[PDB]
Amino acid sequence: MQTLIFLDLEATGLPSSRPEVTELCLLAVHRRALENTSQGHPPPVPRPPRVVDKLSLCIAPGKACSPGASEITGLSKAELEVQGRQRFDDNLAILLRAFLQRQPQPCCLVAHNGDRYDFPLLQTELARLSTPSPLDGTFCVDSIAALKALEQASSPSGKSYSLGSIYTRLYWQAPTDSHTAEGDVLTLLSICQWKPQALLQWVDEHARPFSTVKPMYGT
Amino acid sequence: MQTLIFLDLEATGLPSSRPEVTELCLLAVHRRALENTSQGHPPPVPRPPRVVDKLSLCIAPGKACSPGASEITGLSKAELEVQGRQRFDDNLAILLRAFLQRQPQPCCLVAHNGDRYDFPLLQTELARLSTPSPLDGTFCVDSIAALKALEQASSPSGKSYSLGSIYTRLYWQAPTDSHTAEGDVLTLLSICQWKPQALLQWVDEHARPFSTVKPMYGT
Ligand SMILES: Nc1ncnc2c1ncn2[C@H]1C[C@H](O)[C@@H](COP(=O)(O)O)O1
Ligand SMILES: Nc1ncnc2c1ncn2[C@H]1C[C@H](O)[C@@H](COP(=O)(O)O)O1
Ligand SMILES: [Mg+2]
Ligand SMILES: [Mg+2]
Ligand SMILES: [Mg+2]
Ligand SMILES: [Mg+2]
Ligand code: NA
Ligand code: NA
Ligand code: NA
Ligand code: NA
Structure with a gap:
């Protein structure tokens, strides 16, 4: 895999609520930039790679946010609308396609x-x-599966997997x-810069x- | 003006060298998000607005970076190329157009x-x-002109205007x-969040x- 595209979304609620996206961020890193990272105990927080592409967009949802979602994200439908944010639409798809087309392929x-x-x-x-999906030629991985595989390989002998828990433990x-x-x-x-060659090997083999x-859910 | 698009570029050198862009960042903020900011002396560093769109891209130049440019930016042509970055091309123009089309108009x-x-x-x-410019319907302002206008209005009675100098002085x-x-x-x-209504008024009147x-330079 040439490019890793770190992805995270905010949205109106948990899966049971049939949620809609309110924020999306993509951060594209060439594999070389990650291989080149690197410490101590606890190690200092790694410096991000220098060469990165980033896209972060706020998106007006079609439905209200649940209280918990709004309160932890700091977003609400009404605030997004008053600040002129547009829905998840075909232009957003064109934007995503052009952003992906700048990355060396294949992308995960x-x-x-x-x-x-x-x-x-x-x-x-x-x-x-109505636009074909811009992601149909991409691959994906769940980083939690990679971390758990690293744990099993590093301590077969034998916890929150929240993002914050993992970062703080590291x-x-x-x-x-x-x-x-x-x-x-x-x-x-x-987190992934802690042992980047093992994120990469997981991605190369299990994407x-x-x-x-x-x-x-259905639409 | 509905949207302010904060823009900065890195490039291969100073104007005399006929430079080419190596990095571009756009950060789009609705005017409401800036009006809603706000402290002390020195004031604490303001929190950025919550609702923002951001695009940051590294770009392979057609010519080598000068030493000073490479050393202060941490970019080089060879490093950008080995990490697969593409040139400034028509797809980048399509990306910029789609990003701008998500912003409420007019944009500055x-x-x-x-x-x-x-x-x-x-x-x-x-x-x-070969693509028409995606920026031809946008406006622009130089933030230094705005700061200097604020200084003249706040102290007609009477310094680095480097970005770092201004931030540290504030x-x-x-x-x-x-x-x-x-x-x-x-x-x-x-910096602009220090007195946002005066950036806005400068923009509204002098964009x-x-x-x-x-x-x-010519191409
Ligand atoms: N505790 C709770 N209540 C309601 N909705 C929630 C909660 N945790 C996550 N989410 C929803 C809304 C977030 O935008 C989204 C992504 O979680 P993220 O962790 O930000 O990546 O998942
Ligand atoms: N001192 C010096 N030597 C050579 N080239 C320079 C220097 N200062 C700026 N630049 C060039 C290369 C930077 O990418 C660009 C933008 O300056 P920026 O301040 O990063 O916005 O201008
Ligand atoms: Mg998440
Ligand atoms: Mg999140
Ligand atoms: Mg600059
Ligand atoms: Mg700069
Ligand atoms: Na919910
Ligand atoms: Na369903
Ligand atoms: Na130069
Ligand atoms: Na010329």
Whole structure:
């Protein structure tokens, strides 16, 4: 895989609520930039790679946010609308396609809890459009599966897998900007920079086509 | 003006060298998000608005970086190429157009020293393409002109205008990530959040069409 695209979404609620995306962040890193990272105990927080492409967009949903979602993300439908944000629409799809076309192929999306949340929700949003999906040629992986595989390989002898728990266990500092799409992508990147060659090997061996991801719910 | 688009570029050198862009960052903020900001002396560093759209892209140039440019930005042509970055091309123009089409109109670009560097350089890059410019319906302002107008209005009775100097004079802390496109956009945003209604009034009254900007050099 040439490019890893760290992905995170905010949305109006949990899966039971048939949620709609309110924020999306993609951070594209060439594999070389990750291989080149690198410390101590606790190690200092790694510096992000220098060469990165980033896209972060706020998106007006078609339904209200649940209280918990609004309160942890700091977003609401009414605030997004008063600030002129547009819906998840065909122009957004064109934007995503052009952004992906700038990345060396093949590309793999990497999201924390992606299999149960981000990937099926993104597929739901894309299925509502008239434009072919810009993600149909991409791959994806759930970073939690990679971390758990690393744990089993490093301690076969034998915990929160929240993003913040993992980061704090690694670096003994709390993360910043939790439950913002960009903040959570940056926290995930910092976690993956801890042992980057093992994220890469997991991705190279266990990535799957994004076209296999089923929508979270029907439209 | 509905949307302010904070803009900064990195490139291969100073204007005499006929430079090419190596990094571009746009940060779009609705005027409401800035009006809603707000402290002390020195005031604490303002929190950025919650609702923002961001695009940051690294770009392979057609010529080598000068030593000073490479050393302050941390970019080089060879590093950008080995990480698969593409040139400034028509797909990038499509990406910029789709990003701008998500913003409420009219939009005004805001860049620090934009009139003498960022705006004419961006116009040079866009002039090389076969696609009509995505910026031809936008406006622009140089943030330095706005700050100097604020100084004259606040002390008619009577210094570095470097981005870092201004930030440090305001907040008594050094900025972070200097000479990265995104870091410098974020520093500029923090400066503008000091007295946001006066950036806005300057923009509302003195913005000019980006189509008036002449290329930095001929192609
Ligand atoms: N505790 C709780 N209540 C309601 N909705 C929730 C909660 N945790 C997550 N979410 C929803 C809304 C978030 O935008 C989205 C992504 O979680 P993220 O962790 O930000 O990536 O999942
Ligand atoms: N001192 C020096 N030597 C050579 N080239 C320079 C120098 N200062 C700026 N530049 C060039 C290269 C930077 O990418 C660009 C933008 O400056 P920025 O301040 O990052 O926005 O201008
Ligand atoms: Mg998440
Ligand atoms: Mg999140
Ligand atoms: Mg600059
Ligand atoms: Mg800069
Ligand atoms: Na919910
Ligand atoms: Na259903
Ligand atoms: Na130069
Ligand atoms: Na010329």
